[PDB]
């Protein structure tokens, strides 16, 4: 923001602004499950279908 306006005291003063920043790094995520193939092959019921 610009500095607030003030009454001139006799000699004007140079002021400065304040700028900042913010950084965020990506993160890597994982989720996995292992199942024996014979169970899927022997899945006539269909229990593992909604996996």
């Amino acid at each position: 923001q610009f500095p607030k306006l003030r009454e001139w005291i006799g000699q004007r003063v140079i002021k400065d602004m304040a700028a900042q920043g913010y950084q965020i790094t990506n993160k890597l995520f994982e989720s996995t499950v292992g199942v024996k193939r014979t169970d899927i092959e022997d899945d006539n019921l269909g229990v593992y279908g909604p996996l």
């Binding site: 019921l45 229990v47 593992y48 279908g49 909604p50 996996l51």
Partner: protein, 50 residues
């Protein structure tokens, strides 16, 4: 005039069926708390995945 009280005094009546079905029974409600799952054998086994 004179007659046995087991024939005229018995047959001087008119049967009516107003009293039939005068009251009722509580309405069906199990639909609001249960689903209908038809079965085709002795028992039903249920299985769902986690």
């Amino acid at each position: 005039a004179i007659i046995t009280p087991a024939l005229i005094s018995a047959l001087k009546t008119s049967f009516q069926k107003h009293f039939q079905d005068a009251l009722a029974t509580a309405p069906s409600t199990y639909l609001q708390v249960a689903t209908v799952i038809p079965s085709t054998t002795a028992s039903n086994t249920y299985g769902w995945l986690g």
